[PDB]
Amino acid sequence: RERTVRLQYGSRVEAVYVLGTYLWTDVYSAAPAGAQTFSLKHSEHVWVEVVRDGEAEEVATNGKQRWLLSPSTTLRVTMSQASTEASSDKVTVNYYDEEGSIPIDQAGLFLTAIEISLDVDADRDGVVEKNNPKKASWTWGPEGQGAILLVNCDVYSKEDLKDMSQMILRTKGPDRLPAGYEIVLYISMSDSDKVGVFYVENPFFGQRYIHILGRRKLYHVVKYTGGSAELLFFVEGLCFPDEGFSGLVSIHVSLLEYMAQDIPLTPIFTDTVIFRIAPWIMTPNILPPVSVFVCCMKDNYLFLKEVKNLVEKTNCELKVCFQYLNRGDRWIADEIEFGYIEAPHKGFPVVLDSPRDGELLGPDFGYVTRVTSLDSFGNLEVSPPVTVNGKTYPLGRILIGSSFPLSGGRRMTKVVRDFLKAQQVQAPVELYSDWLTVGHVDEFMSFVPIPGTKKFLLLMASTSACYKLFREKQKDGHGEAIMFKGLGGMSSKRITINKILSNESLVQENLYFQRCLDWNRDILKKELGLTEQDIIDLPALFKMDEDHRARAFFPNMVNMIVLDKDLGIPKPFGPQVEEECCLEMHVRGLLEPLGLECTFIDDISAYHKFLGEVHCGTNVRRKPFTFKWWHMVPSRR
Amino acid sequence: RERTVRLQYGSRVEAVYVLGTYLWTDVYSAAPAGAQTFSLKHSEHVWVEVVRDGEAEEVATNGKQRWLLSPSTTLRVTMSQASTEASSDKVTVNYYDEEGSIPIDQAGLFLTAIEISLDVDADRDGVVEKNNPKKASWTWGPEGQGAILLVNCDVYSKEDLKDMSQMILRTKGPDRLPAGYEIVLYISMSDSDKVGVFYVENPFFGQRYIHILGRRKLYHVVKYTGGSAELLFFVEGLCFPDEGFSGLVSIHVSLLEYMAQDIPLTPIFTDTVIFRIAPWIMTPNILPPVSVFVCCMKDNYLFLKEVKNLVEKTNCELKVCFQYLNRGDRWIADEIEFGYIEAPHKGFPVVLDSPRDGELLGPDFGYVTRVTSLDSFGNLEVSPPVTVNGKTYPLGRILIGSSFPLSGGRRMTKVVRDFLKAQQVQAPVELYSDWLTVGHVDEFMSFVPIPGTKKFLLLMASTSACYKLFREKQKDGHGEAIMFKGLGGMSSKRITINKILSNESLVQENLYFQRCLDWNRDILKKELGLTEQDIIDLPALFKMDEDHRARAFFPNMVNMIVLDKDLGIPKPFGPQVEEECCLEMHVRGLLEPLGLECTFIDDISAYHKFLGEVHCGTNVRRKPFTFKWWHMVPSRR
Ligand SMILES: [Ca+2]
Ligand SMILES: [Ca+2]
Ligand SMILES: [Ca+2]
Ligand SMILES: [Ca+2]
């Protein structure tokens, strides 16, 4: 960067020189009227070129050389090292008329050179490098650069700032700034609700970090200390990307020059760093499980026993919670979503919380707290990593249940949809859930890893599979086999394979629900790049309400606890053939040959009947993806 | 795209097949219980593969082949041509048990194939190509694709729709759609204030085009006609890109299937096109002039005569306007900005209008009608095309005067700043104009082409140049030379070179204003990639007000009429030496050697004095850039 500094007619000029810039200097304006030529001297650490019409020649410290005075003949002044108290850094120009060789006047330029750099970890290694040339930009991808900030999801203490990002103002110079200069750190009004910055204002009095930039504080004057010095700042994000916010914020430092009272200070030098605030990222079922969270009523003993036994087969820990006044019976699944955030060499899990009526588990998590049933997190899923038509989605894609565009049906609130879109790295896809009374994608689909491989399966509810199985068992002589054995509140209904197959309206309803399932099947194959070999159909059956929407006839087996090879599958209570549930046997026959281990989990016996509602919930916290989100290259919007 | 269509147990299935998709068909669900194998027949124009575990084999129209019934053995059904009335397109599956070789049941699939494509000119040649594979995306650059829409800047007539973009729904099929289907064109609620779509609903009754999509209309059912048919739609943009609007809009067509009363229709097939709305683009001084617009009082005869004479030296036309009650005296410069919009094979000039208190020239223009003095268009300029550190700005960069970030000074309204930023193709830069009372960048800088070359110069006001010239003329014995000769209302002041040079406070004021000019010089060199060889300094002088802001002491010569080589330059009324103005002679000596022709234009004599205010304005309409804006690749935000 070239900066204009003119010599002054009939006076000396004193200026600060910031390393990394250079000066172009007009010597002609300061020349007395009638002066013809000029010469110059300069000090050891100041480099001077005489530039005429673009042609530059280096000039010695004390030569006698003279040049014609012209508006097109100027100086270029460069310094490569900061001034110390030993410095006298200067350039002196002498002017001559035609008459003789003794100077008729002189104009000086006295310089104080300083280094000023606002530094961040732009190369994303966890260290703060010196003046990364790319620090004022933010680029995506493996070769991309620019610094990353985490949202704070939780007088100040340094330990409290441990999770924040470091920003270091590095300076070099003499004991003090020359008269009339100050250094100021600042942000825009717009960014003031996106960030906060902390600094120890008075280090002689202790280590106390105070908030110096943020809401209502757009600038802070910082003290200059001499020699080589560093000022350490900690930076936090205040919010995630959203509809009106890209995730990018900027922080500036300027060297300001005092002009006079009532006049603004002049920005002599400005340095800028950019941060991107890390997005919230959801974890698919294929990622390693860490902890399993379940909620249920305190007396559902079978559920607790069976979930405990399932988890004991794994390296996961179990966390048990009971029911609350302000939450639904499924709240750990419906009102809580486990996700994570990551910055170089720091990250943690972050839970989204949307309480029904408005506790937590552990200090290890960050928390983000915020209508129809489509707003529930049961209506959010995320796929495993996929490649679709050559486009990679290394973090998978978020799936959100919705209705058809022209339907006038239900949709997840725009605030949440827009939030998920703005995170960008999971590129959300809308599915069709509004054919279900509750309206959650987890009622009809799930993903499971295939043991021993890097691959996965999509599991889909299928009414066609159920009708085929029941028709087969009827042909085999099992028509009188009863559903819901052991549920006493169902017994009077005497539900058998025969009774189901002869119910004409229920057949028609389920053909329609299969069309709904198949519409989703097609979107999933398109948007996830799946073929029929990637899909397994689990038998399912629904009843229709007055709104023509579906509720489960028997428990939906697709919404299962996935711990690697081990699957907790809701107990279906299907027709018994040879004293085994034919639904359990059929599901084992589909899954077990792939190395999946099935355990059926009974959450409904404690209620004595099944009306389509599930009274328990589970959620699994998983390890984050190995792939760093900042290595993705999302499509430009 | 693969689409799920299942055969139905104990019933025939009839389906529409859309060309460009194919069907996967489950034959297992429709099989009677206990059935073992299946065979199939199909018609001539339906292609059928039997797919087992991913392995596909083509099957003849009538063979006897049998396959084992398995959930993992399915059909893939393809059609390459639309159905006609001569068509019977079908696949029939027969089922067998173990007992014998006569079919025990049969399931049919009856098909009607149609072509449906919503087509736009995505390859940007002005024609609407058939089904551009990239039509649902919009990409920048020479190799980029996707369709372009113009904002409308002005029952309907086809002639009135001439400037709009064409969109054509192309179909092929038999006489009618099968029972229970319709075709619907639609847009999102969000896009409904961004676009409008016109169509002839009833072509048997006339050519009347009606508005079918837009505000309050999100969908339109379109009539299907048989054979090969085209429906022509015209599309308009309603607004330019802005802070909350990228410029992209989408239009969809869906084939919908009727399910039953009270249930939404199913979207069987959907096709999407995207448009980008063309940005508003400003024209720099280097572009060829077309028309010169001037405004002044009716009796400023010298101004009119001299502007007429200047324009007569060129191929430009002159348009003269007088003063209005609702506008400032400079309104043609201050309240009007000439720009343009362009789409493939269509474009026109578009004027931004911001009246002071709230006419036009010509049908040839589009008009966009909308506070401090920084809101004036005198405070907007645009640079010639530049390359900065390897980054090209083929349309130049917009320049907007502002104050320093921490100053608490004036700034152009956010609405206008955000508008200019959102157009993206001119990548705006803020300068510092708030040191001027009026606060307009055109008070201190301008660009001019260098005759005979592809290059240009930045012209900067310079107080240092004025003081140097005046000190020289004083040394030469001209100190008593008077300013403002012929302006009778100035005479009593007896302003001479001596009086100016001896005014100590004015010297100090102008040293400060030179610092302001130099701060801008540095930003311009940085952001436009300019060196000192690209800049000429014109003598200027200012007086300071109570706010420490500048007004011209004598007319600012930098704000000039630029018609290629011919420059209309405000007459300065400088000190007379040998009966010529020394300011005019100095300016000629700078410009004329470069092949620029200078004419001094007197707009102030009719007022008898000069107080810092200019009472006339000029604006030049220019030819658009040859470079197409859609070939640029702007930085991603
Ligand atoms: Ca680093
Ligand atoms: Ca979920
Ligand atoms: Ca075309
Ligand atoms: Ca302008």
Side-chain angles (χ1 to χ4, degrees), chain B residues 282 333 336-337 376-382 442 619:
Chain B
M282 197 172 169
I336 297 305
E337 190 56 64
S376 151
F377 293 136
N379 196 36
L380 282 194
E381 282 191 27
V382 58
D442 73 7
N619 214 327

Side-chain angles (χ1 to χ4, degrees), chain A residues 282 337 377 380:
Chain A
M282 197 172 169
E337 190 56 64
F377 293 136
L380 282 194

Side-chain angles (χ1 to χ4, degrees), chain B residues 125-158 161 163-207 209-214 217-222 224-260 262-297 299-324 326-358 360 362-369 371-425:
Chain B
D125 86 37
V127 174
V128 179
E129 68 269 19
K130 294 174 176 43
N131 194 22
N132 191 316
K134 300 189 179 307
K135 73 194 187 185
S137 299
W138 208 98
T139 52
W140 292 92
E143 318 303 326
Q145 301 200 242
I148 293 167
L149 188 48
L150 297 176
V151 175
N152 177 349
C153 291
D154 194 24
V155 171
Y156 302 87
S157 55
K158 179 163 185 176
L161 312 184
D163 288 24
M164 297 186 182
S165 291
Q166 292 188 357
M167 179 174 62
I168 303 181
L169 179 65
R170 301 190 163 113
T171 61
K172 188 166 178 166
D175 291 350
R176 52 187 23 170
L177 296 181
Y181 294 92
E182 66 174 3
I183 297 168
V184 184
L185 194 68
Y186 70 94
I187 55 167
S188 71
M189 173 67 74
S190 184
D191 287 347
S192 72
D193 66 348
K194 316 296 194 305
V195 298
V197 181
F198 300 80
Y199 168 65
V200 176
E201 171 83 17
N202 314 282
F204 288 117
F205 295 134
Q207 210 64 304
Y209 279 90
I210 68 160
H211 179 258
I212 59 153
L213 293 177
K217 311 185 182 196
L218 311 181
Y219 70 88
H220 194 76
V221 177
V222 293
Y224 170 86
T225 64
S228 305
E230 295 195 347
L231 272 51
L232 178 62
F233 304 85
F234 286 94
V235 187
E236 67 178 356
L238 302 188
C239 62
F240 284 92
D242 225 314
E243 177 73 4
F245 173 51
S246 71
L248 297 168
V249 298
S250 300
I251 304 170
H252 314 281
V253 67
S254 288
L255 177 67
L256 301 182
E257 179 184 335
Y258 183 80
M259 306 305 292
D262 302 325
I263 291 182
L265 283 86
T266 307
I268 299 309
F269 170 82
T270 302
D271 203 19
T272 299
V273 295
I274 188 157
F275 286 100
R276 175 176 289 288
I277 289 177
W280 181 83
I281 306 172
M282 197 172 169
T283 54
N285 288 353
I286 56 98
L287 287 174
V290 176
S291 310
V292 177
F293 294 79
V294 307
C295 67
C296 61
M297 59 180 188
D299 71 342
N300 196 334
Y301 294 122
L302 257 188
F303 175 76
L304 287 160
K305 173 190 161 72
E306 295 178 346
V307 169
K308 283 181 187 177
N309 282 323
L310 171 71
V311 172
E312 283 170 357
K313 300 198 302 163
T314 72
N315 289 126
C316 307
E317 78 185 357
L318 175 64
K319 291 286 183 287
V320 176
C321 183
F322 301 120
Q323 313 287 17
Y324 290 99
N326 68 320
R327 304 185 174 272
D329 296 339
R330 307 200 73 175
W331 73 269
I332 202 67
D334 283 347
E335 303 170 24
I336 297 305
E337 190 56 64
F338 291 84
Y340 71 93
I341 63 176
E342 188 183 3
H345 295 54
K346 14 182 176 55
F348 42 83
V350 174
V351 162
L352 309 184
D353 181 24
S354 305
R356 179 187 64 185
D357 301 333
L360 66 310
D364 296 89
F365 299 88
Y367 297 90
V368 171
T369 304
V371 147
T372 74
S373 60
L374 273 67
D375 295 321
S376 151
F377 293 136
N379 196 36
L380 282 194
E381 282 191 27
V382 58
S383 80
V386 290
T387 294
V388 189
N389 297 312
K391 165 75 170 167
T392 76
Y393 295 92
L395 309 178
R397 303 189 70 183
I398 286 165
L399 308 164
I400 310 177
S402 190
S403 48
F404 296 143
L406 305 181
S407 69
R410 297 174 296 174
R411 197 172 188 191
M412 180 173 286
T413 62
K414 169 180 165 62
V415 176
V416 179
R417 290 190 286 103
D418 284 356
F419 168 82
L420 298 169
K421 173 172 66 174
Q423 305 315 294
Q424 297 184 77
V425 293

Side-chain angles (χ1 to χ4, degrees), chain A residues 2 4 6 24 28 31 33-34 54 257 263 267 468 472 512 515 518-519 521-522 525 532-533 634 636, chain B residues 2 4 6 24 28 31 33-34 54 257 263 265 267 468 472 512 515 518-519 521-522 525 532-533 634 636:
Chain A
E2 185 174 64
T4 303
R6 309 183 180 267
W24 85 269
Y28 183 61
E257 179 184 335
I263 291 182
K468 182 71 170 192
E472 286 294 321
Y512 166 65
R515 286 287 307 273
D518 292 341
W519 194 92
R521 193 195 198 87
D522 296 343
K525 290 166 64 178
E532 284 298 313
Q533 285 65 54
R636 56 185 290 163
Chain B
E2 185 174 64
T4 303
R6 309 183 180 267
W24 85 269
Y28 183 61
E257 179 184 335
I263 291 182
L265 283 86
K468 182 71 170 192
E472 286 294 321
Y512 166 65
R515 286 287 307 273
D518 292 341
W519 194 92
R521 193 195 198 87
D522 296 343
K525 290 166 64 178
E532 284 298 313
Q533 285 65 54
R636 56 185 290 163

Side-chain angles (χ1 to χ4, degrees), chain A residues 120-130 132 145 344:
Chain A
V120 294
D121 167 23
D123 61 17
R124 303 169 183 167
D125 86 37
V127 174
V128 179
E129 68 269 19
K130 294 174 176 43
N132 191 316
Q145 301 200 242

